[PDB]
Design a protein around this ligand. Structure first.
Ligand code: MG
Ligand code: MG
Ligand code: MG
Ligand code: MG
Ligand code: MG
Ligand code: MG
Ligand code: MG
Ligand code: MG
Ligand code: MG
Ligand code: MG
Ligand code: MG
Ligand code: MG
Ligand code: MG
Ligand code: MG
Ligand code: MG
Ligand code: MG
Ligand code: MG
Ligand code: MG
Ligand code: MG
Ligand code: MG
Ligand code: MG
Ligand code: MG
Ligand code: MG
Ligand code: MG
Ligand code: MG
Ligand code: MG
Ligand code: MG
Ligand code: MG
Ligand code: MG
Ligand code: MG
Ligand code: MG
Ligand code: MG
Ligand code: MG
Ligand code: MG
Ligand code: MG
Ligand code: MG
Ligand code: MG
Ligand code: MG
Ligand code: MG
Ligand code: MG
Ligand code: MG
Ligand code: MG
Ligand code: MG
Ligand code: MG
Ligand code: MG
Ligand code: MG
Ligand code: MG
Ligand code: MG
Ligand code: MG
Ligand code: MG
Ligand code: MG
Ligand code: MG
Ligand code: MG
Ligand code: MG
Ligand code: MG
Ligand code: MG
Ligand code: MG
Ligand code: MG
Ligand code: MG
Ligand code: MG
Ligand code: MG
Ligand code: MG
Ligand code: MG
Ligand code: MG
Ligand code: MG
Ligand code: MG
Ligand code: MG
Ligand code: MG
Ligand code: MG
Ligand code: MG
Ligand code: MG
Ligand code: MG
Ligand code: MG
Ligand code: MG
Ligand code: MG
Ligand code: MG
Ligand code: MG
Ligand code: MG
Ligand code: MG
Ligand code: MG
Ligand code: MG
Ligand code: MG
Ligand code: MG
Ligand code: MG
Ligand code: MG
Ligand code: MG
Ligand code: MG
Ligand code: MG
Ligand code: MG
Ligand code: MG
Ligand code: MG
Ligand code: MG
Ligand code: MG
Ligand code: MG
Ligand code: MG
Length: 99
RNA sequence: GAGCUGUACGUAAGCGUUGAUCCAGAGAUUUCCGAAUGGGGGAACCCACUAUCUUUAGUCGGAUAGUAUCCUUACGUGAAUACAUAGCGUGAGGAAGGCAGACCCAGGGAACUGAAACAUCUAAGUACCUGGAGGAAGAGAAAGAAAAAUCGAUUUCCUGAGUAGCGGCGAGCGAAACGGAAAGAGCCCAAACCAAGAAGCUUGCUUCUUGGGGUUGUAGGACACUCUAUACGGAGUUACAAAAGAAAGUUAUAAAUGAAGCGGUCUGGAAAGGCCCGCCAAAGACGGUAACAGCCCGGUAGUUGAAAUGGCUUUCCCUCCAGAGUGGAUCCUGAGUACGACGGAACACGUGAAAUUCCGUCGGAAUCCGGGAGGACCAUCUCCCAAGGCUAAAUACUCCCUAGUGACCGAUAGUGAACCAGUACCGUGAGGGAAAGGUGAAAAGCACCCCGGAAGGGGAGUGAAACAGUUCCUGAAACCGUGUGCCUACAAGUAGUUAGAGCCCGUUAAUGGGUGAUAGCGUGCCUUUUGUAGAAUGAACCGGCGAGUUACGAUUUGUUGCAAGGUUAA
RNA sequence: GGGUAGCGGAGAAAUUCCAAUCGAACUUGGAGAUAGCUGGUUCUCUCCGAAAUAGCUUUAGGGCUAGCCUCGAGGUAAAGA
RNA sequence: GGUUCGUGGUAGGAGAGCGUUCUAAGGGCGGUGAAGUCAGACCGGAAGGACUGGUGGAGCGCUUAGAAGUGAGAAUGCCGGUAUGAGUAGCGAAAGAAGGGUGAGAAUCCCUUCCACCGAAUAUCUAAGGUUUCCUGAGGAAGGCUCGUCCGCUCAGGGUUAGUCGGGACCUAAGCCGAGGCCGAUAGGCGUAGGCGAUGGACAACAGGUAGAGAUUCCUGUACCAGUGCUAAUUGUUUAAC
RNA sequence: UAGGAAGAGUAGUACUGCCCGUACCGCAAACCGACACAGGUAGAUGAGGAGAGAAUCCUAAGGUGAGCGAGAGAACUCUCGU
RNA sequence: ACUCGGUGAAAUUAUAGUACCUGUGAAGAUGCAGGUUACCCGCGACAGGACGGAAAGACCCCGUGGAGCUUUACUGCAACC
């Protein structure tokens, strides 16, 4: 996966195409990403110990990784990513000669 | 290089950039049963002995190591029996069992079937049982093939050829050499002779061990002399003798880097699609992503990379090494064998005119002035030296691993098994042996209200769709129902067809559709039969599945190429 | 609790019993044994269209040759009715 | 394109075609709705082919060739589903009645009283065999030939105590295995020493208590068998207690 | 008896004694019969009246009322009584 | 058995709006011809027909089918002399 937890994201396709957000979790076992404010769902949950009043809950749902491009940190555009050896560790370098 | 504690949701409790989970190489641990091996046993259990250590005041308990049988070989003991042997004990090596339902070598070895019956024959040295291996096995360096001339170990393929032959001369069985190819490789002993030991002393001999020599058919060798070489040179663990160690390179087992569109716009739940524009390409393989993507993701072409272990190839190291000529006086060249009689078998070859090879039982040679073969046998000629052993490649198969391919299947198909399948179930047992795939892009898997004990419903909500609500994509037919337009309670009916009023509708628009009072005619489908409505056979109904195919030969017709020529096989 | 096993065992004898099976158990294989016998064999139209006879047959409800059908090609002193 | 003669047909011969799956090339349509499925009064000489509308929600035709697992109404055909007989036969030996209780619901569950049946058994133990069926708290989909609030059914937690009972560490019978050994194409068969093997031989515990589930086992009282150490006397020591 | 022998018994005290089975059914709805099946299943105990008796009828201790019912009282079939 | 409440099969089955007489026919007809009868739908009963159901006749014949048995059938084998 080219996207990790804590990065900034621009969504490319889907019903919520064209917006931005910050990744909250990653599921590399199944190629899913959870981004705040994207792909909200309404869960009909019974009352229980969690959320004692129950009711309809409005929470995010995971989306596929391919629907996500990592925005350029300095300029602010989605871009493909490349790897360079800086120091003794591999860093991620954009296609606009950035980080 | 950022998440992780499997399938498996979940709660709980935790660990991770001081680098976790994960991937690859090398190690450590490895309960009990099972060859099972200390004894026993009804599988995974029971009971021990001998030494050392250990706890208790001591019994009781614990830990560690050894203890099966057979073969080979050393040492010690040691009976009838005097020496001695058998037996007994100790030590050191080896074996045992499994399987890949494949391939192949040996021992033993059927029947159904065909012959239109059957016994010789066939099926067939097949199925099967047993033993032995190997990654291949078997065969293999002429006592050969053949003929007016030659070849030069074996194996496999194409031809020879369905030829020569065998055959109750029936059904059938059926070669080989020459010729063309793949692959190619040659060697080691026994015996004469020499040197040393001990022994029977078969007593001045022989007879065993050890080492050297030497292995062939124009005969070779021993034996004698002329030459050189004792590492000058050569060879090697795939035969030719055998065991180790390094250096380099390559490869197999994890991986790294890797170009170009978030282009605009339309429909849409969502764009990879339509239309209009760009770019990359040694990369337009494949898969995923909310519908069909070279430019979104994992990747692809290309270029890189291995700490560790294995394979392979060279080099070093290491090891080991005599080969030519001439005379050949004299000696050696595989004995209870080669052959022969009798009884069988294998050879394409069934006792036949029966050569060749092998087994059981009897008899039984020559040995270089010698021996065998050339399909009975004799003479001549030609070829060749048995009764010892080893040897890679070309060939057969696939339980497996890696990378791919298909005018191969697509859930009654394809493996018996796409799913916790040799399972459930059946049988005392060996053994037999199933059924069973699909919500959605994402659980967003229906909060809340109402009827009910619940199940199940009606709203509401999510979703593009709930007539996608947990056999959940599609959802045919048999079968079971609800509503209705036309007909039906004086009628004798293979249920229809032709004529036809009345009533009800309105089409792929044409001398249309539905139902039908009444009238004429009319004994189902299949199979098998001289002949069936048949009181002859089969089918309860619906659905799926279910029967002239392929390989190699023969013959005849059609088409195409060449034509007294045509055509290649491996 | 044990012994006898199928080319075999046991039988005061009946072809009697050997796991609801016995004039020769059950299971797997040879094996898709063989069947001159019965059953079945799936779309359509066009043209032609029989035989149920002779001889031989371990033959008689099977087969072979001839007779009858169909398709293609030939040659005439035209041979058929 | 014309003239003449023809066109019933089983076994059977000959010819021309339709339709299905897959492949190759050309050319196409399809989220503005593909295949499949349902309904129509359309077209062709037949097998068959379109068009329109509903359902469906992602693939499919056309042209010319090629290759076949190539077309089903019948095989007492194989597998699946669903009918008719039909609300029919049956519901597996037997005596029940009423009153209270529980519950959404009671002939069928619980309690009480009366009645009835077995009684060399339909009673009490205990081997084989079964393998959790035992007890408690919940449950009512399926099983129970009806019903069920119940159950040998479903779910979750529990429950089996030994020096003396039965069996091993004791013994042997029939039988089985069997070092060496004898026999035999292989495999193996037989068998000596030795050993396994109860249905038999020997061997030390009795009486009460136990309100969810064990009792010669746990608990109480009183015992026995084998062995060990610690104390106190006794005796014996290599013509030699034991 | 062969053998082993310098320790031996006696009395009192305290301590040690391993493994396997143990629930429940067991003439039965829990075993063998495909079934909650009128069949089959070894052994010990097995009371009273009358009686020779473990026969026979009625009962004790103890255990049961049998897993479809109610109501009518036809033919016919089965098991019984005159 | 019969009526009522609960539960609920099976063999069979080409589709059926399924009369009688005399005749015809593969020679014994609910279904063919000519006549004679007969309003529609059931419940309890009886067994004359559906050449009724079950079991590819066991009697009979056939197959160049099988198996068990016999002997002075043919050819063999063990065993024994
Ligand atoms: Mg072995
Ligand atoms: Mg025979
Ligand atoms: Mg025969
Ligand atoms: Mg073998
Ligand atoms: Mg070899
Ligand atoms: Mg042969
Ligand atoms: Mg890229
Ligand atoms: Mg676009
Ligand atoms: Mg879609
Ligand atoms: Mg001979
Ligand atoms: Mg001989
Ligand atoms: Mg000769
Ligand atoms: Mg020759
Ligand atoms: Mg000759
Ligand atoms: Mg050899
Ligand atoms: Mg399907
Ligand atoms: Mg299958
Ligand atoms: Mg079983
Ligand atoms: Mg899905
Ligand atoms: Mg509900
Ligand atoms: Mg629908
Ligand atoms: Mg779908
Ligand atoms: Mg339907
Ligand atoms: Mg009238
Ligand atoms: Mg009328
Ligand atoms: Mg009309
Ligand atoms: Mg005929
Ligand atoms: Mg006839
Ligand atoms: Mg009839
Ligand atoms: Mg017939
Ligand atoms: Mg029938
Ligand atoms: Mg043929
Ligand atoms: Mg030609
Ligand atoms: Mg027995
Ligand atoms: Mg036996
Ligand atoms: Mg035997
Ligand atoms: Mg006998
Ligand atoms: Mg008799
Ligand atoms: Mg008897
Ligand atoms: Mg055969
Ligand atoms: Mg056949
Ligand atoms: Mg005609
Ligand atoms: Mg015949
Ligand atoms: Mg003929
Ligand atoms: Mg004439
Ligand atoms: Mg015609
Ligand atoms: Mg034809
Ligand atoms: Mg298709
Ligand atoms: Mg459609
Ligand atoms: Mg087919
Ligand atoms: Mg059918
Ligand atoms: Mg069926
Ligand atoms: Mg009836
Ligand atoms: Mg009744
Ligand atoms: Mg009853
Ligand atoms: Mg009551
Ligand atoms: Mg009584
Ligand atoms: Mg009695
Ligand atoms: Mg028991
Ligand atoms: Mg049981
Ligand atoms: Mg249970
Ligand atoms: Mg209970
Ligand atoms: Mg219930
Ligand atoms: Mg019930
Ligand atoms: Mg229970
Ligand atoms: Mg006690
Ligand atoms: Mg005991
Ligand atoms: Mg005992
Ligand atoms: Mg032995
Ligand atoms: Mg023995
Ligand atoms: Mg003995
Ligand atoms: Mg014993
Ligand atoms: Mg006993
Ligand atoms: Mg005792
Ligand atoms: Mg109890
Ligand atoms: Mg007690
Ligand atoms: Mg009991
Ligand atoms: Mg039972
Ligand atoms: Mg009952
Ligand atoms: Mg019973
Ligand atoms: Mg008395
Ligand atoms: Mg009495
Ligand atoms: Mg009482
Ligand atoms: Mg009752
Ligand atoms: Mg009745
Ligand atoms: Mg009733
Ligand atoms: Mg007839
Ligand atoms: Mg007549
Ligand atoms: Mg008549
Ligand atoms: Mg009539
Ligand atoms: Mg009636
Ligand atoms: Mg009748
Ligand atoms: Mg009949
Ligand atoms: Mg018959
Ligand atoms: Mg015979």
């Amino acid at each position: 996966m080219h996207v990790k937890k804590g990065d900034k994201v621009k969504v490319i396709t889907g019903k919520d195409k064209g917006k931005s957000g910050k990744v909250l979790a990653a599921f590399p076992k199944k190629d899913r990403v959870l981004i705040e404010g994207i792909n909200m769902v309404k869960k009909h949950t019974k009352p229980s110990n969690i959320n004692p009043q129950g009711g309809i809950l409005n929470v995010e749902a995971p989306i596929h990784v391919s629907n996500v491009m990592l925005i350029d940190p300095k300029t602010g555009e989605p871009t493909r990513v490349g790897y360079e050896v800086k120091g003794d560790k591999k860093v991620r370098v954009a296609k606009k000669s950035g980080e």
